[PDB]
C-alpha cells in the first residue's frame, strides 16, 4: 500500500483499538505492553488464562486505555471467529489486528509428522484468515491495519522447520496477494508483513540451546512498521541480515506485470 | 542437490517407473505422453476415470513399458497414501513423483472465501506432503525425484488468486526446507519446482480469456529438470520471465547461512 | 545526504552555474532550464558560433546572466582556466554541471588507440581537472557536482567500448571522492546521472531503425538531471521506460558498501 | 564467451605459451611458479630486471618449458607494443596473454594530484589495451585467453583508491564491451575478468598496515584460481577469503540484462 510519510510518534496508537494474538509471553506480551504504554485499548489472547489476567493487569498499570483477555486455542476455528467479534465489542470497534501467534515450534528434521504440517498450517496460517474475515468489516470503518508477524524461514528456506516454513511462506503468499486486491479495489486496509530474525524470548533461547536481539525492540518494531502502513517489516540483530534478506527485484517485478 | 553435469537425453526416463498426478488433462497429461513416448512405466491419477483410461490407451500406444491409472481426489489423504502404495506395487517401486494436480481455480478477489483457503490447502499442498511421505521409502531406494509443480503466483505475488498463492508459497517453502534436510542427513533424493507462466492448457485459456506457452514443450520441460535433479524449473513464453523471476540471491544467503 | 523535500524552480533562483558541452543536445536544454529558473550560466563547448545561439536564448529566457567560454576539454590547462574564469566572472559557483564527451560513434573496437586515449581525457581526467578546478567555490557554497553518464557506464554494450571504459571510470572515481567527503566532512554533494536513449541529434544519427522511437525527450532529461542535483540525490536514472529504470539499478552495491565501511579506519585521513 | 563444461586439470597449461605481465613480485610472481610447475612457456615482466631475473630462476627449476624475461615500464605504450611482439617470437606464438600489473597505488585521500590519476589510467587502463591489440593476432591463431586482474575496488566504490578504482572500473567497461564485440564478430579469445578481496602479497599488507583487520587470502591460492578461470574460459572469476565476498559482490542480474537488451538490437550494421 501506500506508508504514511511520516516520523513514528506513539501517540499514532493513542485509543486505538487494537487485538494482539500470541499475547501471554514473548514478543507479543511486549507488543501489549508498548501500546499500553501509549494509551491504546487492547485485546489480547493466547491459551494462557492466568498469565493472560497478569499481562492485562500490567497493561492497565502502564495506561492502557483499556484492556481485557479472552483464552482459547486458534487450532479452533470457531473460537477464532467469536473472538474477533467479542474484541470488537469490548473496545467498540477495531483499528489494529496484530496476528503474531504460533503452535508449538522446535528443531527437528521430517520424518512422516504430518499431524505437525497439519497444525502448524491450521494455526500459524489458517487462523490468521479466519481472524482477518473476522474482522475486515471493523478494519475498513477505521481503515485499519492487519499486521502479520512471519520469520527469516518465511522468506528463504532452512532445515529442521519444514512445517513452519510451510505456513509462513503461505502467509506471504496469502497476504500480499490480498494487499495486491485491496490497491485495485481502494479498500483502505493496510497490510504489513513482519520478517524477524533470532529474538531472544523463551521459547527461541530455548530452542537454539543446542546450536539474539531484544524482544521489546523487536515488538516496538513491528508496532511502528503497522502504524506507518509499510509493507514489510524487517528486524534482526545485524544488519547484514536485514539489509540482505530483501528482495526488492519482486516488488518491482510485481509492478513492471501489473 | 546437484543437477547432473549432463545433457538431456531421453532414454534417461526409459524403464523408470512414474506417477503423474493430475494427469487427465493439461500439462499433467503431456507430460504422462512424454514418458510414454520415452518407454517409462506410468501410473497416472487425477478423479475421472474415463478420462484417465484415454489416457492410459493413448500411453500405450506410444510406447510405454506399462500405463496404469488409479482414480481419486486428493481431497481425500487416505486415498493419497494407499495410491501410492499401489502405485508403486503396480511397477515394483518408484524412480520419480510428479505432483502436479491443484484444485478448481479461477480468477477473483478474496471475500470471505474460507472453504476455498481450506480446499487450496487440503488439495494444493497437504496431498503433496502426504505423497511424498508415501513415496520416500521407494525413492530411497531408487535415488529417485520428486517434482512439484508450481506456478508464478508461487514466487510473487498477484490479485486474484490468494487462496492458490498461498497453497504455492507453501509448496516451496515445505519443500525447499526438506530439500535442505536432505543434503545434511545425506538422503539421495532430489527436489525440483518448477515455476510455470502462462501455459496454454483448456483451463488457462479459460481462466483468462499475453502469449500462452504450449503445453506439450512445458511439460517436456518439467520432465527433463527432474530427470537432470535440477532444483527449479523456469518456463514461460519469454526469457524477460524465467531470467528476471529467478532469486539467485536467496540460494546464496541460505548457503551463507549454514 | 539528499534533501527530502520536492523539486521546486526556485531552488536554482540566482546560483551560479557552469554546464559544459551545452551548445546542442542535453547541455542546451540543461541551460535553457537554467535560464527559465533565473540562473546564473556559464556555458562551454569547442564553437563560439553555437555558444552564442545559446546564450542569446538563455537571455531570453530570463537567465539572471549568461555567459559563453569556448575550448577544448582535450586541453587540460583550458579546463582549469576555464573554471578560474567563469567562477569569477559569476563571483563564485554553486553547481558544476559536466557533460560533455568527445565525438563517439557506434563501431567495433579495431585498434584505435587514439580513440581509447582521447575518450579516456575528455570523457574522464577532463571531468576530474574540472572538479579540482571548482572544488574550493563549490566548499564555499556547499554546491553541487553533477556528472553525465549512461546506461554503458553501469552495464556492457558491444560498439561503446573506448565509451563505456570512460564512463566507467567516472563511476569508479566520482563514488570514491563521494565516500571521502563524507568521512572528510565536505558539504559537496556529487550525483551520477545514469540515461537512456535520450532524442539528441547525436543519438538520433547514432541509432537505427525502430530504436530512434524508443527515445526519450532531452528537455526532460535535462530537468530531471538538474532536479536530481539540486536535490543533492546520489543518482539519477532517466529512461522512456520504468522496465529500464527500475531494473537497472544494483540497490546491492550500495548495501555492501555500507556494509564494508566498518572494516576501516579513517582517523588518519 | 561459453566455458569449458570440465574440471580444470594442470595439463591444460603444458606446453602452453603465456605471458605474465607485473609478475615479479605478488599474484603475478605466483602466476609465473604455478605455470612454471605445470610446463608452460613463460615470459614475465615488471620494471625491476632483479626480481624478475629470480622469478625466472625459480620458474626454470620448477619445470617451465622455457621461462624469460623482458623488463620495462608499462607508462610507456611503445615498450608495452613492443614487448609482446618479443615474448612471441621468443615463445613461437601465445596461448594466454595475463595482465596484471599496476602503478604504484597507497591509500589516500584524493586533492588535486591529476598526475598520479593520469598515470593510473596510463598504466592500469591503457597499457592493458595496447597490450591486447598487440596480442590479438597472436590470440586468434592459437584459440587463446586475455586474463584481466581487478579488484573489489573495480566493482564496488570505496574512499581513498579514487584514481585507481576508476582504472579499474575501466577495465570492466572495455573489456566486457570487447568480450560481447568477440561474441558478435566470431572471434574465439576468451576474456576473463578476475576480482580480488584481500590478498596477502607485500603491497597490500604494507598498504592496509593500520587501516584494516581483516583476513588476507593467500597469494598463492589465489594466483591459481585465476590461472584456473582464464584456463576454463571463465567471464569472471572472484576471489577472496571469504565466501561472503566472493558470493554476495556478484552480480548475475547484470548479466540477465545485458543479454536481454541484446536480443532486441540487430548488430548486423554497424
Ligand atoms: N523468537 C524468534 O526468534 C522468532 C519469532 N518469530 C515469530 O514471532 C512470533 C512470536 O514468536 P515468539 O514470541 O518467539 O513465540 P512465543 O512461543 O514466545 O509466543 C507464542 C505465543 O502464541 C501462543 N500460542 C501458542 N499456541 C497457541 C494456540 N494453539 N492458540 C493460541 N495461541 C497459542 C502462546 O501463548 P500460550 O502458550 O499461552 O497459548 C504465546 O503467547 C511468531 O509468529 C513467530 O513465528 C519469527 C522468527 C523468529
Ligand atoms: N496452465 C497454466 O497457465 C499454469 C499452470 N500451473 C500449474 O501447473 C499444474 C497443472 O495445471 P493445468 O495443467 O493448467 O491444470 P488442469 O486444470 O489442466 O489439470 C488439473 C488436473 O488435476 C486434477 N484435479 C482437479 N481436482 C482434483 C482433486 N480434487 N483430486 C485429484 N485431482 C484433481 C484434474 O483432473 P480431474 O478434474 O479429472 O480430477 C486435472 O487432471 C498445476 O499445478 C498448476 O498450479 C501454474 C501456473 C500456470
Ligand atoms: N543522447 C543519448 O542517448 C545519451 C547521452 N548520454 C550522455 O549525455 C551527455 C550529453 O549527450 P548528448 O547531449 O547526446 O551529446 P551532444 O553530442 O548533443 O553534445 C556534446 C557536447 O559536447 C561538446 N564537445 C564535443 N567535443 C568536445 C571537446 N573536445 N571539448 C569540449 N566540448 C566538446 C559539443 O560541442 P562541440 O562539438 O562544439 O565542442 C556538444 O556541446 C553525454 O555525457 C553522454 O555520454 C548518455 C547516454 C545516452
Ligand atoms: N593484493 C591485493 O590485495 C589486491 C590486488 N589486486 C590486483 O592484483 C594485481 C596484482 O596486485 P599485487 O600482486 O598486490 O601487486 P604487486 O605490487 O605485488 O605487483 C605489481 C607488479 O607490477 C609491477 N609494476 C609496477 N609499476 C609498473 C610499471 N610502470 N610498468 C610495469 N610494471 C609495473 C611491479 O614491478 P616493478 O615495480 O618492478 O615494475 C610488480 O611486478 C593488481 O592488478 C591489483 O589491482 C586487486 C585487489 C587487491
Ligand atoms: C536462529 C536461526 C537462524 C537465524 C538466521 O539465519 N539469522 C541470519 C543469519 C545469522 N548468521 C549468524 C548465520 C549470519 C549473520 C551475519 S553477521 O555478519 O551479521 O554475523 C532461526 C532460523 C529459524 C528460526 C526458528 C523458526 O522461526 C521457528 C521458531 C519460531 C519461534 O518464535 C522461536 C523458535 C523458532 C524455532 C525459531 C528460532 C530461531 O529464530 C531460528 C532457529
Ligand atoms: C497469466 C497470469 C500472469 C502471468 C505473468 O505475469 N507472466 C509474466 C509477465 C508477462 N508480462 C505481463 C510482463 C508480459 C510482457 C512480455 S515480455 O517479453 O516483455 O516480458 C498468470 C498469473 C497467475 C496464473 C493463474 C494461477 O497460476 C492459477 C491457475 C492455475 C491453472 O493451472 C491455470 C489457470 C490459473 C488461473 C493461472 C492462469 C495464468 O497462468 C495466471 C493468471
Ligand atoms: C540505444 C542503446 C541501448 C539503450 C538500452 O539498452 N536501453 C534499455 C533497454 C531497452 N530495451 C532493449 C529493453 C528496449 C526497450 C524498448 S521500449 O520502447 O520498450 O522502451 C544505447 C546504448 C549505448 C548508447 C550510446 C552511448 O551512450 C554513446 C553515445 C552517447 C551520445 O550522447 C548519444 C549517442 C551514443 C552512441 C549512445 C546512443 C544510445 O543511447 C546507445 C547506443
Ligand atoms: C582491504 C580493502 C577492503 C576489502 C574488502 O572490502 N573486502 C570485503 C569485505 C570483508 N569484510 C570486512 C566484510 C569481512 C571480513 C571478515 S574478516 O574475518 O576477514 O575480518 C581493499 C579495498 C581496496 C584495496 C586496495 C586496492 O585494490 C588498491 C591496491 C591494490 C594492490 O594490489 C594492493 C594494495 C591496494 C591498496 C589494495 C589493498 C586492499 O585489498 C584494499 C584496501
Redesign the interface.
Known amino acids: 500500500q501506500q506508508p504514511l510519510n511520516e516520523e513514528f510518534r506513539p501517540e499514532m496508537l493513542q485509543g486505538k483499538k487494537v487485538i494482539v494474538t500470541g499475547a501471554s509471553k514473548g514478543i507479543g506480551r511486549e507488543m501489549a505492553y508498548h501500546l499500553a504504554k501509549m494509551g491504546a485499548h487492547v485485546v489480547v489472547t493466547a491459551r494462557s488464562k492466568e498469565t493472560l489476567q497478569k499481562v492485562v493487569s500490567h497493561c492497565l498499570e502502564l495506561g492502557a486505555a483499556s484492556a481485557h483477555y479472552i483464552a482459547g486455542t486458534m487450532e479452533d476455528?470457531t473460537f477464532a471467529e467469536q473472538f474477533v467479534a467479542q474484541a470488537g465489542k469490548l473496545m467498540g470497534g477495531l483499528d489494529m489486528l496484530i496476528l503474531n501467534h504460533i503452535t508449538n515450534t522446535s528443531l527437528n528434521?521430517?520424518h512422516?509428522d504430518?499431524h505437525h504440517?497439519?497444525k502448524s498450517?491450521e494455526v500459524n496460517?489458517?487462523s490468521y484468515?479466519?481472524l482477518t474475515?473476522a474482522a475486515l468489516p471493523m478494519l475498513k470503518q477505521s481503515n485499519g491495519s492487519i499486521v502479520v508477524v512471519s520469520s527469516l524461514?518465511?522468506?528463504?528456506?532452512?532445515?529442521?522447520?519444514?512445517?513452519y516454513?510451510?505456513?509462513?511462506?503461505?502467509?506471504?503468499?496469502?497476504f500480499?496477494?490480498?494487499?495486491?486486491?485491496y490497491?485495485?479495489?481502494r479498500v483502505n486496509v493496510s497490510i504489513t508483513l513482519c520478517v524477524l530474525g533470532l529474538i531472544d524470548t523463551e521459547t527461541a533461547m530455548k530452542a537454539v540451546s543446542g546450536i539474539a536481539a531484544p524482544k521489546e525492540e523487536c515488538a516496538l518494531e513491528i508496532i511502528k512498521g503497522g502504524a506507518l502502513r509499510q509493507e514489510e517489516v524487517y528486524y534482526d540483530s545485524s544488519?547484514?541480515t536485514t539489509?540482505?534478506?530483501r528482495?526488492?527485484?519482486?516488488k518491482?517485478?510485481?509492478?513492471?506485470?501489473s
Open positions: 476455528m528434521l521430517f512422516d504430518i504440517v497439519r498450517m496460517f489458517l484468515v479466519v474475515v524461514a518465511g522468506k528463504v528456506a532452512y532445515p529442521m522447520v519444514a512445517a516454513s510451510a505456513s509462513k511462506f503461505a502467509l506471504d503468499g496469502f500480499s496477494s490480498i494487499r495486491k486486491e490497491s485495485v479495489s544488519l547484514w539489509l540482505l534478506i528482495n526488492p527485484s519482486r518491482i517485478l510485481e509492478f513492471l506485470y
